[PDB]
Amino acid sequence: HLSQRQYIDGEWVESANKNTRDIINPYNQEVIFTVSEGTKEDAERAILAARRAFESGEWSQETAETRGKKVRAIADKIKEHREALARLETLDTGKTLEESYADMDDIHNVFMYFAGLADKDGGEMIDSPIPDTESKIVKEPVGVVTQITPWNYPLLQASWKIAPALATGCSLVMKPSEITPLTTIRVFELMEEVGFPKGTINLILGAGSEVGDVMSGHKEVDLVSFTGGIETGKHIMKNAANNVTNIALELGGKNPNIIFDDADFELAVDQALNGGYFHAGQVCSAGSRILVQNSIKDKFEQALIDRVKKIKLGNGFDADTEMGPVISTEHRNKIESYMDVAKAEGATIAVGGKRPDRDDLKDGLFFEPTVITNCDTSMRIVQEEVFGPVVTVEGFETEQEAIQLANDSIYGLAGAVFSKDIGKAQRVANKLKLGTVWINDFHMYFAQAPWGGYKQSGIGRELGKEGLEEYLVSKHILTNTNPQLVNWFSK
Amino acid sequence: HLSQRQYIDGEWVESANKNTRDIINPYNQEVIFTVSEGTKEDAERAILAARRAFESGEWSQETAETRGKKVRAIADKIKEHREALARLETLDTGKTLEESYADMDDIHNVFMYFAGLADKDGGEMIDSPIPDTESKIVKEPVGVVTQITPWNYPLLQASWKIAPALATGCSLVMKPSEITPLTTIRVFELMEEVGFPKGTINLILGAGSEVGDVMSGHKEVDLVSFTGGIETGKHIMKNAANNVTNIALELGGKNPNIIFDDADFELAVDQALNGGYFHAGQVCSAGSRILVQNSIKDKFEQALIDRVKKIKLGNGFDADTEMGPVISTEHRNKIESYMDVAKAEGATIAVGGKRPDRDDLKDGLFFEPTVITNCDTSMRIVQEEVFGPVVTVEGFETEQEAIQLANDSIYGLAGAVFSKDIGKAQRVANKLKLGTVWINDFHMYFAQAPWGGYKQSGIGRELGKEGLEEYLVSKHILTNTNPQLVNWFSK
Amino acid sequence: HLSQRQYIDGEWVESANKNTRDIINPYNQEVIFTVSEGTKEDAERAILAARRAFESGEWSQETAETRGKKVRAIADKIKEHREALARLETLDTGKTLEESYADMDDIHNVFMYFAGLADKDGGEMIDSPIPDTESKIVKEPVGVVTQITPWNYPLLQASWKIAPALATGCSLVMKPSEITPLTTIRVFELMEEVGFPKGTINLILGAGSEVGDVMSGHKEVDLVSFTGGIETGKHIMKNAANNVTNIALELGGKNPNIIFDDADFELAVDQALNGGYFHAGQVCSAGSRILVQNSIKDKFEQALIDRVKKIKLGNGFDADTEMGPVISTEHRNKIESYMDVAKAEGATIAVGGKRPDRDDLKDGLFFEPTVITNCDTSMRIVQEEVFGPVVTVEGFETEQEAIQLANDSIYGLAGAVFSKDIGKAQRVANKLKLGTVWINDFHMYFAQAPWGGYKQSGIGRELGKEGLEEYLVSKHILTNTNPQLVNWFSK
Amino acid sequence: HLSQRQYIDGEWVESANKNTRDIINPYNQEVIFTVSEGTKEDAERAILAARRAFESGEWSQETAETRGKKVRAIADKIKEHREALARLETLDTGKTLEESYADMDDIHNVFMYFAGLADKDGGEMIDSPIPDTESKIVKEPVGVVTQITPWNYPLLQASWKIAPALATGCSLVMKPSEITPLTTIRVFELMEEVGFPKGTINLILGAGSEVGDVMSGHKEVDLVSFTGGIETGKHIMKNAANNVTNIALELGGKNPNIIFDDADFELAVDQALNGGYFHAGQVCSAGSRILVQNSIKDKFEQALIDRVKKIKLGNGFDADTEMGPVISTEHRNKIESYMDVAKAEGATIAVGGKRPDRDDLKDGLFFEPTVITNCDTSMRIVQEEVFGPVVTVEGFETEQEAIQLANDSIYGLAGAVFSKDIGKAQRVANKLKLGTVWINDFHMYFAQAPWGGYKQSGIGRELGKEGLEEYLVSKHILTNTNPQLVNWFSK
Numbered sequence A, B, C, D: 001h002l003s004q005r006q007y008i009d010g011e012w013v014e015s016a017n018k019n020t021r022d023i024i025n026p027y028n029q030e031v032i033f034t035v036s037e038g039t040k041e042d043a044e045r046a047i048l049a050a051r052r053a054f055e056s057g058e059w060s061q062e063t064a065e066t067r068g069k070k071v072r073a074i075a076d077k078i079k080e081h082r083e084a085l086a087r088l089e090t091l092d093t094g095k096t097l098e099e100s101y102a103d104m105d106d107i108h109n110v111f112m113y114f115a116g117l118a119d120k121d122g123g124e125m126i127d128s129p130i131p132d133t134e135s136k137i138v139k140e141p142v143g144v145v146t147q148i149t150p151w152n153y154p155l156l157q158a159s160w161k162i163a164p165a166l167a168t169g170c171s172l173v174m175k176p177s178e179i180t181p182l183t184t185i186r187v188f189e190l191m192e193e194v195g196f197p198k199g200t201i202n203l204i205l206g207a208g209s210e211v212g213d214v215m216s217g218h219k220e221v222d223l224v225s226f227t228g229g230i231e232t233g234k235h236i237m238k239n240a241a242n243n244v245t246n247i248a249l250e251l252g253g254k255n256p257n258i259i260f261d262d263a264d265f266e267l268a269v270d271q272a273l274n275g276g277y278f279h280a281g282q283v284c285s286a287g288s289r290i291l292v293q294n295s296i297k298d299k300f301e302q303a304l305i306d307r308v309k310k311i312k313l314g315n316g317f318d319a320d321t322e323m324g325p326v327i328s329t330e331h332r333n334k335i336e337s338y339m340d341v342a343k344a345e346g347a348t349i350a351v352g353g354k355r356p357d358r359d360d361l362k363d364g365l366f367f368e369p370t371v372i373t374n375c376d377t378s379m380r381i382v383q384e385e386v387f388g389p390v391v392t393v394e395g396f397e398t399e400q401e402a403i404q405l406a407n408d409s410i411y412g413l414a415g416a417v418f419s420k421d422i423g424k425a426q427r428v429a430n431k432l433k434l435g436t437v438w439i440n441d442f443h444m445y446f447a448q449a450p451w452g453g454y455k456q457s458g459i460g461r462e463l464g465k466e467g468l469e470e471y472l473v474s475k476h477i478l479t480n481t482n483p484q485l486v487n488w489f490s491k
């Protein structure tokens, strides 16, 4: 019953060239669906439709209160279809059903948060420094927005972009990862049910290498919003520059998990596993870089390694499963290549580091949860985002050394500090160059607070009021209420 | 008594290669000063010093209240030295001394505004959706910032960047236009008198082609703030992408001056001259594109042309001067080439369009104030920013047509609507895709309100609270106040 | 099927003394229902329950997001029960069913607005002027709130108080007008369906003279929020002073309707009728004081008078009815007494000023729509709030005189300016000492914007962000992160 | 050289009846100065002048930027005259010169803060839920404000009221405590030097019993701002009610100083002395109610008592003095009466509790620093604000009991928690019903953050943005841009 087509200008349409793509379940590498594989001309048509819709004013000039009501209706549909959406996300991405349910709860809350925010702030009145003038700043929708999402949390990442775009009155063109389009197709069906003016929302399906440059480089786009890897992000930004187009980027990280000797030890072990291995480490927020105080380093490594051996791999639909497969053959190959890099530069693969042998896992894209030890900040395995079920462990002596090491990367997305000394944790948090810092927690983020990176982890923010602001533009309207001639130029 | 050197890491220093540049007065093309012409290694040293200073915390961890007091001290020095600063700006850039005084008054007010804003907003407390958590957003200085300014309003543009950078606790590296460094050198001397930690402020002098790429592309930069032309801006953005560096750009415009038939006619003529010819049209806010309602078009053209013939050209130091020279041989040549373009595509040079013949103007870079008529939106002369003492005049029939034509450019910086029907002016203002819209005024902007462009006129804002926000970064600190093990992974 | 009891500490309960009150329909003066008439001990028990619930934290420490979801659920129930609620409001208060439907649409929007606002703040991070300190302002629910509403728009006024109280996490005790409790009982039934912790919400039914002083004067109350008349409001404020309790008051007005000679004349006549006679003038926002420019005063009076003669009086349930009865015998008597005052001080009753004679209106509390002319600012009829279907008409010569007269009252709630000259309307609006000014409109207010009075019209605001803020209290938490002894006192 | 007169409507004037008052130095009870003792007619004249000035618009319509510049000029004058002002405050109030210097530094910062805030927020643009409307909220000065200050920190408390009143464009009438007018007279002289429109600022000198009711009860007042005791505050609020006038009250407190067994012990002793005895305990922020964990109660009492015996009493001008005299005979008598109350209800005067005998202290209004032990929450000595150099000590067993006891008073101004367990201190801080909570500090407050009380400690806030907001009023201006007749009433 799921659509196999793109959604352009109010219609479900095939690709202009009738091409298709088979979508795969990473658990067994079986084809689960076939969808349209769109062309660059389809993408251009969608952008032009979005522009036409924006200029018509049917959505952009709708009242903010009414826009909020429609975004709330989307939220309710997510909750109504929570089970089926979660199952589809697990089928498409491989992560556990429980993880998918949590995603759907978050997605409902994202739409609901932005629904509520829609009508809360139209700008400001400025006390003008010029007598006999009125000065106001009006906040308008930024315009036409292109939105590109990755394969790890397809619908969650889509919601972070769609909700504020709709709440503010923008028109959008979204393109999900070509290998994971299923939930994004479904959410477009649900949005269509709610009802938006023709051209306000558009869904393109296809390879980034075919349609991506149109989405980032088109002159009618006012904002490109992208979540993915650093290489694609940089390429998008350079293409966006051709029209001086606003960019919002979230590009992953090398997130430190800092564990002091006065941490609650079993909590720290639990959260080190959570940070490292949820969704097989395929998370922008993954705690791939463990920094542990020297005094407890050996204790910690032994404890972590013993637990990693017990992680239950399997089908995301099976209730006992703790960790599913990685997303694709290409991604598994990349993780495997990093194991070779790590060994060649002198690190130790303490546990894991290979494909599992078990019969029920042999047809899937599984990779064992892995701990890499005896490494240092100079190493590629420590500096680079592997985005797999892999953590490195480094020791540190002092609070100052923990901070130095944690900040010694090109990234700046998120991190954690574990210590029962809250004063110390707060000092460390203040010094980490990260968009989010958790004190005695991990992977906590939500619609109410902005998420994004310092340094190469991104530009701008998603979620919160700051997330909504990516979709607004300020206009200063200054009215002279007693205009007088300047009489500078001779008469 | 003015310094001839760069200011790097608390010391006035020559270029690493001892190279120098002769600075010219455009009124007579005479050499007025000789300054150091820095190298890319000087720029890198400055950026590294800025980073070191930032990490030291001496400025970034100073209280916001005290940072505000120092910014206020800069403001007071500008006012103290108003006369000498104005004279330097007029010598270096050619605009009238009266215009330069107005600039110094504005600059005082910019510093004073940001001094007052420094300690007014450290972030937010978030009502977390997770029980037993505290969520806060702390706003920190963005980090190390590079600041590149143009030749038209050197100190004014510098102040828009320096003031918020210092107020927020950033370290900065500034590079003024190579052809107009004098007031920027002077302001650095004044800042040095106020006293800032070593490395907090740095001044590089040199050609954009030699040191610009280091300033935009260095890994230790967190924000590149640029004001200038679109070609350089796009280039900067592409280079900034290499490290996913934030950019704030202001790139000029094709600003419409919309004159309805129910405008106060003599006011509209006065403001059309002001929009077209202040600083010989070398203004990001210049009203180069006049759109006049058809019913008064002939009346308007005759009136404007008659006034343009009376504009007094001369030395900026002479009180009777209404318009000085353009900035350089290269810029005058560009303006001259546009006259040829306009004629070839079928427009009429109604008045001006050449160098003036008068003896006292023959040694200077003068160009006559010009009105181009019988043109249309398809023409290069109408679409492209000439940045000279040149306006085009197009007619429109309806309010809808005025909006369409005004929005028919790649730019989106500022514009005006002249009409005694305020309701109509407000309708038009709401539909113009411009960062600033004046109703019955022109060239009005000030520290209290954000300034910047839609579309190819820029990214981000300068001035106002939004201007300060370019120099901040948000950090979400989430504390779990009752941490519990998740117990997801097997034990 | 409607409850007849109070709702105290999670239970529907009779009065402690078993007393009751008969509720009347003003259209026919028939008894329509009988409810409990509570005692001062019931009110005290409710306040103590509200305090106990607040201290338990079950609502006050619930997440803001979840509080918002519950307030949204109340909003949806209002819409679900729109027809029955509207009919009950018309039965109890006499206004037209069409007016009641509009109320129910507004009430839905009030709850929805506050539902969406619930989780959008939390407080601020302050950049502290003291080194080695953290400064934050946390916004908490104000505490226990008592809420007292009037008989004119019972559920609408209740919604303005309940929505923000619940959104912020307060516990509340509400007492509707003793003569119009029906829709307030119903909304409590609906809130019970949504589910709130025992003691969070409480409904007291009874005479202000019996239970009012407890509600305003109890030591466990943190805010008293009252909407009604000036005499009761002043009494409440004086009683609240005994515990230095916050007060939010809205006390009606003497609202000017300013009509210039360049107003759209038929619009001004239409809106003068709307301002004067909706709900038989029993509206805090009624335009009871018409100020009309002398040049059109005769034209205006004749046009208004001719229309007033055509106003259709009748049963609020009948679709042709334009104006229902007034609320009670006591109120009709008050209005009648004002007619005598007006004549005695020299004014003219130009039309109306008595009970209508028609057979179908004889059993109801009807009073004819009335226009009073030949009056001036010195008169009681002009200065005092009659709160009936009565308007006075005064002339003014100039814009300056209009402002002077409009501001010449003890009140300051709302007003309008009618003029096609928007600049003039804006000048006047800026000078009027009124919480709301309409330019070319009347009776426009909504959840998104604050409503309240200057001068004797009130203290504080309802609706908007400022309305929510009445229900919050600020706490500055300052942590010294490197505490040192002061060593002032000798050792 | 100091003025002896009132300042009314731009002129220094004596009392209407030529009455005067002798001002005393509490160190030696000698007459130090004689000032005018104004009449209620003088107060009325000042209020009418303030109203006339407000309506003139000369200050209320001045640009916010310029108002800020003038407030900054006042700040600079305070710093310029720091020495003389500090000496005058010490002469008039008795506190140490070092304390007075700190006050003057704080006062400079208060004026500077508000100077910087003046032009930062003129209101909001609202996204209206009604099509074809514009909705804006303009923030105006509240109007005419009366300001009444106490004798303990005369100029500091005056600055908290004057600075925001002037920044926002209000007109003000200030009346300092009749017994301590000196620095308030001086600051009026300084303000006059800056220059404000006639009637914008006014100073009344006299007994609260003679002129106070006019200041709180006059119909032309829009806000009464009072800092003092609860009895006077309640009386002011009841009088203000006569015109439904806004009130801002700060009425002192029973501030808890909570010391856990895991506090830094010597820090806690130091801060218990600071909280109890600065300005001889005559501070709204005094830590008069010490709550100490039972486990360390005996240790703490002995350590505190031993230190209290060493406190150096003397002349505020002498550098070795740690504590000066109390303010007046009447106040010393009140403190003495409380010693009798404490003993009669069963408490122990552990140290102090009498006038000192030493020869150099015999002519002054000295009272020994006192510690009261063996008391409980039921006692008047624990519940009531003594406002002298007196602390009570109660024990608590648990964190829960500490919170219960601390919240068991009618007040709610400020308090502290001392514990090295920052998580615990934060839990306690969140549960205390206090406007300010210090974690490991005491007496820390500043212009950047709001100060005020829950419960009987006050209404509203001073300092910070919220403090400025007491001096603003919101006006919703709603413009219908396409007005249509409603056609409800028959034609």
Ligand SMILES: NC(=O)c1ccc[n+]([C@@H]2O[C@H](COP(=O)([O-])OP(=O)(O)OC[C@H]3O[C@@H](n4cnc5c(N)ncnc54)[C@H](O)[C@@H]3O)[C@@H](O)[C@H]2O)c1
Pocket (backbone or CB within 6 Å): A148, A149, A150, A151, A152, A175, A176, A177, A178, A206, A207, A208, A209, A211, A212, A213, A215, A216, A227, A228, A229, A230, A231, A232, A233, A235, A236, A250, A251, A252, A253, A283, A284, A334, A385, A386, A387
């Ligand atoms: N931040 C995150 O959540 C996240 C998610 C996925 C991957 N990554 C990182 O990126 C690495 C590479 O992953 P990847 O290559 O599979 O993902 P990617 O960075 O290319 O992101 C994929 C998305 O970008 C699109 N895309 C590709 N080329 C584009 C182009 N030229 N223009 C516009 N869009 C284009 C894809 O079609 C897809 O929608 C991963 O190993 C990981 O380190 C991060």
Ligand code: NA
Pocket (backbone or CB within 6 Å): A023, A024, A025, A026, A091, A092, A093, A179, A180
């Ligand atoms: Na898939």
Ligand code: NA
Pocket (backbone or CB within 6 Å): A453, A454, A455, A456, A457, A458, A459, B243, B244, B245, B246
């Ligand atoms: Na970045």
Ligand code: NA
Pocket (backbone or CB within 6 Å): B023, B024, B025, B026, B091, B092, B093, B179, B180
């Ligand atoms: Na030059």
Ligand code: NA
Pocket (backbone or CB within 6 Å): A243, A244, A245, A246, B453, B454, B455, B456, B457, B458, B459
């Ligand atoms: Na742009």
Ligand code: NA
Pocket (backbone or CB within 6 Å): C023, C024, C025, C026, C091, C092, C093, C179, C180
């Ligand atoms: Na009734």
Ligand code: NA
Pocket (backbone or CB within 6 Å): C453, C454, C455, C456, C457, C458, C459, D243, D244, D245, D246
């Ligand atoms: Na009032």
Ligand code: NA
Pocket (backbone or CB within 6 Å): D023, D024, D025, D026, D091, D092, D093, D179, D180
């Ligand atoms: Na004194």
Ligand code: NA
Pocket (backbone or CB within 6 Å): C243, C244, C245, C246, D453, D454, D455, D456, D457, D458, D459
């Ligand atoms: Na109170």
